[PDB]
Design a protein around this ligand. Sequence first.
Ligand SMILES: CCCN1CC(COc2ccc([C@@H]3c4ccc(O)cc4CC4(CC4)N3C(=O)c3ccccc3)cc2)C1
Ligand SMILES: CCCN1CC(COc2ccc([C@@H]3c4ccc(O)cc4CC4(CC4)N3C(=O)c3ccccc3)cc2)C1
Lengths: 206, 226
Amino acid sequence: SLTADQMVSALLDAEPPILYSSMMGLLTNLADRELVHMINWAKRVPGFVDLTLHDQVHLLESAWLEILMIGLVWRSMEHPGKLLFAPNLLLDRNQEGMVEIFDMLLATSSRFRMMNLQGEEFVCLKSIILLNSGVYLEEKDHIHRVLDKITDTLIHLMAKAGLTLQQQHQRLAQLLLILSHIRHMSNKGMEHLVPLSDLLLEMLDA
Amino acid sequence: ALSLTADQMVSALLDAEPPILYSEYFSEASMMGLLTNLADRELVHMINWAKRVPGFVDLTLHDQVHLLESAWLEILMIGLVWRSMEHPGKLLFAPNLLLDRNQGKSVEGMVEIFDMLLATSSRFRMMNLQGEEFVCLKSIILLNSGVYTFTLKSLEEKDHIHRVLDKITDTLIHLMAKAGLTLQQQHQRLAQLLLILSHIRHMSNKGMEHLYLSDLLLEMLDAHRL
Ligand SMILES: CCCN1CC(COc2ccc([C@@H]3c4ccc(O)cc4CC4(CC4)N3C(=O)c3ccccc3)cc2)C1
Ligand SMILES: CCCN1CC(COc2ccc([C@@H]3c4ccc(O)cc4CC4(CC4)N3C(=O)c3ccccc3)cc2)C1
């Protein structure tokens, strides 16, 4: 029942902190620590906690790598040709099978830069990833109605910025098509890299 | 291409549609050979269809090749899902090759992809996906799948592709408006359809893993004018 502005404000307030950092060990440890904060972010995405825990976990399990990637790309926008894994861990291209994903992450930053992706748009995109990556009756209906609400909210953000109706639906499409590439990176990422579900369940107990 | 009305975009895409091909005129042991032969014959028609997607032949040959290398499996899959939409629980690879889940169980890792395709077909069925929407979505896959994995020329190329993608977005919205959808419903349905493309990409990546081109794409795309 939230308004678009209340949706945006809830997502903005829910943003996780930027954590700080042998290379792969460090990146794995950073990712593991960010995942905890991801869980607490997800609990604040409006609509998420109305799902069963089993469904909260399947969605997090499907989405977590995409969410880490889009977060990395978002905080890397202002660092052309580099990835800001942490404020103390800025890596460029020159830093097997890694450069291919690195280039794909860099291409995403470049796309966000070309689009001038806004922060309010970023948090909507992350929320969509959370609710969408695992959707493939009543529980899915609810997921789709929350997803619909985020679509309403993105359009509202674009109207408030003064875009024409045409530009609104063009930009909405451009943003959602980026999510196909983020999925693609996640799949390649998974290839390149106790069930995670048990870990996610434990994390939900704080 | 950038001057087409939405109705002219729909018309060009509908006319460009490839034919529905058949399998040879069956067994678990011969099934993969039949599916591979079907895909190979469909790929030829794909190329011809791509050349008829407005704006596609404005690109360099190298970029046309790149886009089709990136998108061909997704395009085969979305075509399959569309043909299968009115056959619940089954995949209509061809009019004479309608397969159920159990026929996939015979090949390792096959049923997982089969189930994802079935769920996409069920989702299109639930949304009552229209043929005019389908051809827009397939044209989006062609132009979008490879656009993040490509000089001043390259920048011009990418800008062109995004302008054509934008025109197909306008066309999708025009279609939904003509169908009587409120403006909220139009934006929502647009988003729902585009998010399914994320899942089609997911299936393609899993499918490529399971299945395990360029100069062949070249030879059909690099036609002479004789
Ligand atoms: C819960 C126990 C299981 N864990 C053990 C499991 C390790 O998973 C992970 C391990 C490492 C990472 C890093 C990471 C860290 C933080 C970040 O914000 C973003 C990323 C990006 C990411 C692309 C994915 N990555 C890489 O190194 C990378 C590789 C190739 C090219 C470029 C980058 C993410 C996930 C998960
Ligand atoms: C020079 C080009 C090389 N060739 C490229 C040639 C192999 O690629 C292909 C080989 C087979 C296929 C079939 C096929 C055929 C027609 C169709 O419309 C759709 C599909 C769907 C598809 C999912 C992809 N598939 C499967 O069997 C399948 C597997 C697991 C679950 C479900 C189905 C597609 C592509 C070798």
